[PDB]
């Protein structure tokens, strides 16, 4: 149970060195002190947040089945304070990726609606047609036999915007002169599995409008495709960088955890820590300590005092 005493910067480096060495068992110097009380909570919190963010991204990356081998570089384990900035850059990726997916879904929805419009423009309306026999009957119940029901069908329908599959679709569209029936069938169609939202138009002007939007949506789909390919390129590069950094971060957290398990000096901003180690290890550690302190710019002697307790 020997006690070592040295500056917190030298301690940072030493913890790095001792943790990779793996032969030191540390004792907790402040059993009555909580993480808030240790004052490493800011560093751990930062670690936890970036950890969660990386995990979030990693989960999305895994969902996409990316090859990222996560081959090495992990053994270098540096822990600069600049990791906070690295974290933010990776945070930006998460935000970007989430934004893109959110936007992608939004664009996807718009695409499907415009896809319906393509079919809607004579005019083929869009229904799910699960039970149209009943839709028709309800329509006649509210008024039977008053107006012609026009039928249209969709050839080779594509994936249902909701169901996610390809089913045949056909629709009965009725023009009404009365407002009471428009409101009636609005409520009916809302209850029924159908998309009958726009007004039918015979005028050429609406056909031109539909042509316009049918082109625009195609352009938006091309943009979607481009943003998704970019996202995939970004995700592969991040996958490699993140897997390696992720492990490095886990080590960072490990270090800060260990650093919490200490006593903070009052005389100098130094920590004293106790380890239980055999002499063989103690000699190796002294050498390790020189290596550690040498990596730190302060090269603090970092005295370890043998104890017979």
């Amino acid at each position: 149970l020997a006690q070592l005493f040295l500056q917190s910067e030298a301690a940072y480096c030493c913890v790095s060195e001792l943790e990779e060495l793996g032969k030191v068992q540390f004792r907790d110097l402040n059993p009555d002190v909580n993480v808030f009380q240790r004052k490493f909570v800011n560093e751990v919190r930062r670690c936890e947040e970036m950890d969660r963010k990386l995990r979030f991204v990693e989960k999305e990356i895994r969902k996409a089945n990316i090859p990222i081998m996560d081959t090495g570089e992990n053994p270098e384990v540096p822990f600069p304070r600049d990791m906070i900035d690295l974290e933010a850059n990776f945070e930006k990726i998460e935000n970007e990726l989430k934004e893109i997916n959110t936007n992608q879904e939004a664009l996807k929805r718009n695409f499907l609606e415009l896809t319906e419009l393509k079919f809607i423009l004579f005019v083929a309306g869009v229904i799910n047609r699960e039970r149209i026999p009943t839709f028709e009957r309800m329509l006649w119940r509210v008024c039977r036999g008053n107006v012609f029901l026009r039928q249209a069908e969709i050839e080779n329908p594509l994936e249902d915007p909701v169901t996610g599959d390809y089913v045949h679709k056909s629709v009965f569209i009725i023009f009404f002169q009365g407002d009471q029936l428009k409101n009636r069938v609005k409520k009916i169609c809302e209850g029924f599995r159908a998309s009958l939202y726009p007004c039918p138009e015979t005028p050429q002007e609406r056909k031109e409008m539909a042509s316009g939007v049918n082109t625009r949506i195609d352009d938006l789909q091309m943009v979607l495709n481009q943003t998704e390919d970019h996202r995939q390129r970004v995700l592969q590069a991040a996958a490699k960088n993140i897997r390696v950094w992720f492990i490095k971060v886990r080590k960072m957290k490990a270090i800060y955890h260990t650093l919490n398990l200490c006593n903070i000096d009052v005389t100098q901003k130094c920590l004293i820590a106790e380890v239980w180690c055999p002499v063989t290890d103690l000699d190796s550690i002294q050498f390790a300590l020189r290596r550690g302190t040498e990596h730190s710019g302060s090269t603090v002697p970092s005295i370890l005092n043998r104890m017979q307790t």
Partner: protein
């Protein structure tokens, strides 16, 4: 007696015979009663108005039906021309619905046939609303008199502990305007009746000899009066309590007892006096309400028939009085009769004809 209100396209005049004459399609093989409605020739402006009318009439029909029930139940409480066991259906203009339907017409007296549907529906609605409010007022007045009367009857009812003394005590039982005596009333258990007659003498100082008597008797206890010195009132009551007698402090008051009896008789008289005309008025207004129920639903069926079939407006509408256990056959016959002529598009929702239940 329940009736079904049904209307067919009426495209052919043969429909009446088809409906009524030809056993294959006649209601229950022409055993059930089926009478034609006489409906004036009214027009529907637009389809949108037709639909509005449809909903508004369904609402108004339920409203009036409820009112009819409310007024009928009121009279049932009155027990004037309707009871719970008999005379449940209201009469239309003083005759039964069966009679009324036999001679059914749309009534120009309730709404001119030259009125638009909006105006007609409004006039009837206003009529029924007014009828309901009139009922609310008269019923409140009757319920008020009924409760207050019973409360007064109850006040002078009951056992000797709580029953009003008004019908018990006489002016001739008390020494009135006495200089120094007070009269106490004691309710004595039957088992201690003779005991009281004697014991009361020794419950206080300064008691007048042989002044006691029995004022009234009951099955569980007797009510006796005693006259004694004013200051002994406290002692008598205490010793009376000790001997398990209940002693009431009752000061005879001729004016209060008479006033109470006059109020009881006055309210009884006023209640009967209002009742007579009350129930005569209500009976009349309820008949009118029932007829309105009939008119408004005949219109309902009119406009629904128009909405269901279009124009012209000559439909085959029959009032059916089902035969016992014939509802299966009736459905069968009406289904075959009209289903083959229209479409599969049209129970509670889809029926080959217009059909409303008359709950009578």
């Amino acid at each position: 007696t329940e009736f079904w209100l049904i209307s067919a396209p009426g495209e052919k005049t043969c429909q009446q015979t088809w409906e009524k004459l030809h056993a294959a399609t006649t209601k229950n093989n022409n055993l059930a009663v089926s009478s034609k409605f006489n409906i004036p020739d009214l027009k529907v402006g637009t389809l949108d108005v037709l639909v509005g009318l449809s909903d508004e009439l369904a609402k108004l029909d339920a409203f009036v039906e409820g009112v009819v029930k409310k007024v009928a139940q009121y009279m049932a409480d009155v027990l004037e021309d309707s009871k719970d066991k008999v005379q449940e259906n209201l009469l239309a203009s003083g005759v039964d619905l069966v009679t009324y339907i036999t001679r059914f017409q749309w009534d120009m007296a309730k709404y001119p046939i030259k009125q638009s549907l909006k105006n007609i529906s409004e006039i009837i609605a206003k009529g029924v609303t007014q009828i309901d409010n009139d009922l609310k007022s008269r019923a409140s007045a009757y319920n008020n008199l009924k409760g207050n009367l019973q409360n007064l009857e109850r006040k002078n009812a009951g056992s000797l502990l709580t029953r009003s003394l008004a019908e018990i005590v006489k002016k001739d039982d008390f020494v009135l305007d006495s200089e120094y005596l007070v009269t106490l009333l004691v309710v004595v258990p039957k088992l201690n009746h003779n005991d009281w007659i004697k014991q009361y003498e020794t419950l206080a100082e300064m008691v007048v000899p042989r002044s006691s008597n029995v004022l009234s008797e009951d099955q569980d206890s007797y009510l006796c009066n005693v006259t004694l010195f004013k200051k002994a009132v406290d002692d008598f009551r205490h010793k009376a309590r000790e001997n398990k007698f209940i002693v009431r402090d009752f000061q005879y008051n001729e004016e209060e007892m008479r006033a109470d009896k006059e109020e009881m008789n006055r309210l009884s008289t006023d209640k009967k006096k209002q009742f007579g005309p009350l129930v005569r008025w209500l009976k009349v207004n309820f008949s009118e309400a029932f007829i309105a129920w009939i008119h408004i639903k005949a219109l309902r069926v009119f406009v629904e028939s128009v909405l269901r079939y279009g124009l012209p407006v000559n439909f085959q509408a029959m009032l059916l009085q089902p035969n016992k256990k014939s509802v299966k056959k009736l459905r069968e016959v009406l289904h075959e009769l009209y289903k083959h002529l229209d479409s599969s598009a049209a129970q509670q929702e889809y029926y080959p004809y217009v059909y409303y239940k008359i709950d009578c």
